[PDB]
Design a protein around this nucleic acid. Structure first.
Ligand SMILES: *P(=O)(O)OP(=O)(O)OP(=O)(O)OC[C@H]1O[C@@H](N2CN(C)c3c2nc(N)[nH]c3=O)[C@H](O)[C@@H]1O
Ligand SMILES: Nc1ncnc2c1ncn2[C@@H]1O[C@H](CSCC[C@H](N)C(=O)O)[C@@H](O)[C@H]1O
Length: 289
RNA sequence: GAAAAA
């Protein structure tokens, strides 16, 4: 057990490190059904609420590349829809999207794997709409990663979004090829990720027609492995005794801090009240008990 | 990276 004031929201805040134990991969990584779908929903709800909070979400077109099956996206769509927000969703991916996204007047399902030219095409057919970028592409070896990151960067250059959420999982230091550059932004830690995932999300709001790239070296690669391992093995594997809530596991503690930033069209007397409600609807919708 | 029942 443990007593915590608040969970580690952004990577930079992970106070300790632990050298990766390869035996870890032999442990079960998914404890509940549709864990990934849940993990995606919370991060997106969270980022998209920071957007709502800034007044960047209404009238925007959310381009989610690498969106299949996207089961959780229908919940996101209904959410802001019921909130009164105007959003236009364009889901592009070569894999088939969940049937519950069909015929939705405000979502565009596009079956196709994205590339440079197709970015110019969607940018074209979208402008002057304010684009919000969400990537989740994954071709997995470092080569694949570096490739996906080369695309994620040009997605920003071509699409020129006003804000973006990228998939960010640094190459393990033992399979390193070379150094690369990534956009600058807040590295958001996500709950309900696989037990020993090193994946976090790079959230960034653009000043306008801007960006900024930062270098990543093998030394950085080692720091990630160290910090992330510690977070997964220790921190996440704990029960927060000072967390007044049915489930007191770290991930739920962390989700309570994510879920409390999201807006709802109904009135709630307390944060825990709203949190209980949102978690309920999400879990029931996703069929997670 | 995602991955109910069957
Ligand atoms: P996601 O983005 O978290 O998932 P992905 O499938 O890309 O990678 P993951 O399962 O984490 O890793 C695949 C294999 O690589 C070794 N791992 C995992 N892991 C967290 C980790 C590994 N190796 C080193 N050096 N350091 C790490 O931090 C295992 O063989 C996994 O099976
Ligand atoms: N160049 C590319 N363009 C678009 N999607 C791509 C891509 N390369 C890989 N992908 C897609 O990226 C996805 C990674 S997993 C995505 C899970 C999805 N976001 C969810 O909500 O369920 C895969 O479905 C893969 O088909």
């Amino acid at each position: 057990v443990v007593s915590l004031d608040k969970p580690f929201m952004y990577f930079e805040e992970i106070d300790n490190e632990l050298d990766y134990e390869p035996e870890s991969a032999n442990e079960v990584a998914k404890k509940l059904p549709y864990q990934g779908q849940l993990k995606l929903l919370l991060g997106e709800l969270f980022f998209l609420s920071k957007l709502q909070r800034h007044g960047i979400l209404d009238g925007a077109t959310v381009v989610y590349i690498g969106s299949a099956p996207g089961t959780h996206i229908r919940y996101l769509r209904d959410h802001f829809y019921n909130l009164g927000v105007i959003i236009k969703w364009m889901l592009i991916d070569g894999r088939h999207h969940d049937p519950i996204l069909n015929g939705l007047r405000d979502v565009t399902l596009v079956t196709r794997f994205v590339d440079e030219e197709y970015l110019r095409s969607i940018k074209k057919q979208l402008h002057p709409s304010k684009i919000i970028l969400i990537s989740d592409v994954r071709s997995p070896s470092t080569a694949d990663l570096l490739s996906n990151y080369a695309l994620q960067n040009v997605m920003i250059s071509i699409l020129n979004p006003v804000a973006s959420s990228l998939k960010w999982r640094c190459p393990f230091p033992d399979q390193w090829i070379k150094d690369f550059y990534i956009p600058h932004g807040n590295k958001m830690l996500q709950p309900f990720a696989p037990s020993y995932s090193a994946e976090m999300r790079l959230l960034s709001i653009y000043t306008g027609e801007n960006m900024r790239l930062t270098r990543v070296t093998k030394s950085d690669a080692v720091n990630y492995e160290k910090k992330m391992y510690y977070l997964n093995k220790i921190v996440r594997n704990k029960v927060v005794v000072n967390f007044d809530y049915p489930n007191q596991e770290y991930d739920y503690f962390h989700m309570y801090f994510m879920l409390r930033t999201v807006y709802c069209n109904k009135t709630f007397p307390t944060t825990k009240a709203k949190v209980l409600f949102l978690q309920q609807s999400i879990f029931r919708f996703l069929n997670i008990p």
